Structures are given as structure tokens and as C-alpha cells.
Scaffold this active site. Structure first.
Site, PDB file in Angstrom:
ATOM      1  N   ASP A   1     -54.860  60.498  24.394  1.00  0.00           N
ATOM      2  CA  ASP A   1     -54.524  61.299  25.923  1.00  0.00           C
ATOM      3  C   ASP A   1     -54.429  60.327  26.677  1.00  0.00           C
ATOM      4  OD1 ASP A   1     -54.144  63.486  27.058  1.00  0.00           O
ATOM      5  OD2 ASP A   1     -55.849  62.979  28.547  1.00  0.00           O
TER       6      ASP A   1
ATOM      7  N   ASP B   1     -52.914  61.547  30.350  1.00  0.00           N
ATOM      8  CA  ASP B   1     -53.501  61.623  32.101  1.00  0.00           C
ATOM      9  C   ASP B   1     -54.212  62.097  32.463  1.00  0.00           C
ATOM     10  OD1 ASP B   1     -50.469  62.044  33.097  1.00  0.00           O
ATOM     11  OD2 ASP B   1     -50.321  63.705  31.792  1.00  0.00           O
TER      12      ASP B   1
HETATM   13 MG    MG Z   1     -55.654  64.509  30.174  1.00  0.00          MG
END
Ligand code: MG
Length: 478
Positions: free
Chosen positions: A50, A52
């Protein structure tokens, strides 16, 4: 000192890949990978990320403060009172993972069973018997997703504080009259639930239609942690496996953040030619829509990287160098990289959308990034004193029961619990209230195979390493 400060200070340090320095470094807690279930890194064929709050850790409290002020201004522009503009984000109040009860306007810290550990109405902490008026059994059904909202990610830190600001404001403003489920002002009734919905919508709007992304991208050094060791870890992962990105963000924002994260005068190590961030990935997928991604997904699309718009139609072709995907599902990753779920280590910060769902629905191996863990670790060691105490008292209380004193010690337990909790913040530790573990803690243990303050801590372990957890025994097995 914020949790991001400890991350940024570790990030400034270059990689000493001497093998003795790595074992020394890895055994300090801040740099260790913690193990709930055993994982043989040699069997991992794909490392997935991922973005962010995983690769891109936003600096605290600057980023939360920006999200807070932009959300407050959105609420004011749709008609909330101007007094909201005098609110200022306070990082010492919110702890992640709180539950907002949209019926009674309370922030709740619960355990894995819905038992109340802390109940806060605005800034007024409701204790013991007063909570029984609204929670007769001191318990909530967290399955009731229409009433309760769990504030699970670091993106929710601003609204966690904002919800308490609003409840406090309306409660104490003389134009409003308090009711069980909201505030009345003449012929206008604002329920806590519609107040909650406005806050959620404003946060969404700020992120997807307001100026949050613009203001972030135009001062990345202010808002985003950068670490020269990232290209090194990724290129090392690329030597023994395939590497992929699967993020909910769109391509344009992803491009801007990832370009910043690799913006060094070198590639994997000082001295090496710089390489574009995309060259570190065998598969790049944006608009993932996790957790749906781990079920049906959506239609697989191809990004036009020159324009940042999706090409018209469903992409039916092969994995091809330079291609960027949008949507799809976890099966896209498995087919295109030729992997099965237990060949995949997925790395992310969303306990629900990244970790729980990929584990339960697809059998992926999981690595949970917990940015706060740096500061939680600092407090947990520094204040081990009161926890050992707390353990001793419950043990002593039991011997009392089988044989005043008990009532005196129950109050002594409550005082120590509170003293320990207040050292993390007003809502206490992410992982517990005194001796009681939080829902978040139990979900880490249950669904994160590994977890760490940062994914970078994998750099300090060889890639043959067997992360070993202790064998679990039931009470009767001992
Ligand atoms: Mg995230």
C-alpha cells in the site's frame, strides 16, 4: 515529540548492511519486526505494498492539522457556526481506533468484545456508573455498523478530535438545547448521527474535491516522511521476488507522492544512478478500491500515464512492461504474477481494508505497518512500572476472593490504570487501557502475521529468515 519524529530520525540514517550491524540494529525494539504467526521469508515470492501511511508516512501533527482545518472550513462553508474556525487540532486527544456512537454522540474505546474501556462525551470522560445509563451492560455490538463507526486509520485522527470538538461545542453553547440523541435549536434538530455524517462527508470532500492533495503536493517536505533506504529495500526485494504496488489512490497523486519518495541523488544506494519509482515494481495498480479489491473487485482498467486518465475499455492483455493498472481484484495480482496467496506478503496500514480482508478472504500473508508504534514503544518501556503493578494487583485480588480490602484494591487498580493510560494521551494507548487489550490490539494479533513501526525494518533481516512465533497452547494443554 510525535511518532513521525522517531520515524523521520531513523529515516535520516543510511543503511549499514554489515551483517553484524543488522542483527544489533534489529534487536532494538524500534527497528524490529514483531511476529504473531510464523513466516518463512524464503517462501515469499511477491512483496506487495500500500502507499498512504505505508510507503508514504505523513508527518504528525502537521498533516492531521491540515486535514482538520480544511475539514472545519468545509463544514463552515456548508453552514455550521463560525465558532468552528477557532478550533485547533490537538494531537494529545485522539487515539486511533475509537468507536463513535452516532446514537448518543460518544467516543468509545472498546475491547475485542465490545466492552467499554473509555467513554468520552465531548471532552467529559464518563466513568463507571454514569455510562450504565446509556450502556446498561457496559458493552456495544460493534457488528452494528449502522450505529457505530470505527475510526481505524491515521486519516481518521482529525475527525476523531473534530467529533469531540463539535459535541463539546454544541453541548456548551447556549443557543442549543441538549437531548439524548442530539441538539435542538428552535425548530431545527441536529442528531449526533447527522452531525457524524456531515463530518465524514467533509473529510471525503476535502480529500477528493477540496485542496488537501494540492496543499500536500506543493510542500511535500513539510508533510511527508522521506527515507533513502526505501529504494534499497525495494531493489533487494526485487532480487529474490517480484514487487507490486496496490493502492486506493489515483495515478496522478500516486505519481506525485512516489516521485517524491524516490527523489534522491541516487538509486538504491548512494553512488548508483537514480531510477524512476515505477522501475522498482513488476506491477503497479492504482484505484484498487480495497477491501472490495479482495472480493469481486472491479473491472480491470489501464491507465494512460501521459494523461493520467483511464483508457476506455477493460484491459484484457498480458502483464507488460510499463503498463499501469486500475481497479481489478486480488486475482489480477495472483494471475499476472503467477502467485498463490501464501506466496504474497502484503504490507499496509489499514487493519481492516489491507490486513483483515486479504488474510480472511484470500489467505495472503500480512505485514501491518503501525506508525504510532515508535512512540507507543517509548512509553511502554519507560512506564513498565505501573503495568507490572497492575498485573500484581489482579493476582492478589483473586487470592482475596477465594479466602474493604477487595473494594480498596478495585479502586487502586482503577487509579493505576488511569495513571498508565494518561501517559499516551487522553484516549490512552492504541493497544490497551490498563490490563485490558483494545479491539485494535486483538485484531493486530489475529490478522497481522507480522507488524512493525515501519516496513523498512524488513531491511534488517536476511531474506532466508524464519520469523518465529511461540506455539499457542489452550489452558488445558499446559
Ligand atoms: Mg494506507
Amino acid at each position: 515529540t510525535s511518532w513521525s519524529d522517531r520515524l523521520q530520525n531513523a529515516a535520516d540514517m543510511p543503511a549499514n548492511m554489515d551483517k553484524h550491524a543488522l542483527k544489533k540494529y534489529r534487536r532494538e525494539a524500534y527497528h524490529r519486526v514483531f511476529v504473531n504467526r510464523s513466516l518463512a521469508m524464503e517462501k515469499i515470492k511477491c512483496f506487495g505494498f500500500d502507499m498512504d501511511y505505508t510507503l508514504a508516512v505523513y508527518k504528525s501533527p502537521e498533516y492531521e492539522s491540515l486535514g482538520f482545518e480544511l475539514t472545519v472550513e468545509r463544514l463552515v462553508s456548508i453552514g455550521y457556526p463560525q465558532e468552528l474556525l477557532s478550533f485547533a487540532y490537538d494531537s494529545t486527544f485522539p487515539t486511533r481506533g475509537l468507536v463513535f456512537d452516532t446514537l448518543y454522540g460518544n467516543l468509545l474505546k472498546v475491547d475485542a468484545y465490545g466492552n467499554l474501556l473509555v467513554c468520552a462525551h465531548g471532552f467529559n470522560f464518563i466513568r463507571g456508573p454514569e455510562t450504565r445509563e446509556q450502556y446498561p451492560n457496559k458493552f456495544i455490538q460493534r457488528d452494528d455498523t449502522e450505529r457505530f463507526y470505527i475510526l481505524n486509520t491515521l486519516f481518521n485522527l482529525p475527525e476523531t478530535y473534530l467529533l469531540a470538538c463539535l459535541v463539546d461545542f454544541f453541548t456548551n453553547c447556549p443557543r442549543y438545547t441538549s437531548c439524548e440523541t442530539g441538539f435542538k435549536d428552535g425548530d431545527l434538530f441536529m442528531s449526533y448521527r447527522s452531525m457524524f455524517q456531515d463530518v465524514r462527508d467533509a473529510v471525503d470532500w476535502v480529500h477528493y474535491k477540496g485542496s488537501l492533495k494540492e496543499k500536500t503536493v506543493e510542500n511535500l517536505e513539510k508533510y511527508v516522511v522521506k527515507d533513502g533506504k526505501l529504494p534499497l529495500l525495494l531493489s533487494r526485494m526485487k532480487e529474490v521476488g517480484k514487487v507490486f504496488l496496490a493502492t486506493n489512490s489515483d495515478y496522478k497523486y500516486t505519481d506525485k507522492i512516489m516521485t517524491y519518495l524516490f527523489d534522491f541523488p541516487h538509486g538504491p544506494k548512494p553512488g548508483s544512478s537514480h531510477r524512476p519509482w515505477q522501475s522498482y515494481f513488476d506491477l503497479i495498480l492504482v484505484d484498487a478500491r480495497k477491501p472490495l479489491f479482495f472480493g469481486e473487485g472491479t473491472v480491470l482498467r489501464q491507465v494512460d500515464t501521459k494523461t493520467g486518465k483511464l483508457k476506455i475499455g477493460t484491459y484484457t492483455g498480458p502483464l507488460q512492461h510499463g503498463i499501469v493498472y486500475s481497479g481489478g481484484s486480488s486475482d489480477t495480482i495472483c494471475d499476472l504474477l503467477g502467485a498463490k496467496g501464501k506466496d504474497i506478503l502484503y504490507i499496509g496500514d489499514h487493519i481492516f481494508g489491507d490486513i483483515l480482508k486479504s488474510k480472511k478472504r484470500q489467505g495472503w500473508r500480512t505485514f501491518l505497518v503501525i506508525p504510532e508504534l515508535a512512540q507507543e514503544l517509548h512509553v511502554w518501556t519507560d512506564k513498565s512500572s505501573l503495568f507490572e503493578e497492575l498485573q500484581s494487583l489482579d493476582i492478589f485480588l483473586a487470592e482475596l476472593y477465594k479466602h474493604p480490602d477487595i473494594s480498596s484494591i478495585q479502586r487502586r487498580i482503577k487509579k493505576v490504570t488511569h495513571d498508565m493510560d494518561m501517559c499516551y494521551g487522553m484516549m490512552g494507548s492504541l493497544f490497551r487501557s490498563g490490563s485490558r487489550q483494545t479491539l485494535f490490539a486483538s485484531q493486530v494479533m489475529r490478522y497481522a502475521d507480522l507488524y512493525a513501526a515501519s516496513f523498512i525494518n524488513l531491511l534488517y533481516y536476511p531474506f532466508s529468515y524464519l520469523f518465529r512465533a511461540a506455539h499457542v497452547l489452550m489452558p488445558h494443554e499446559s
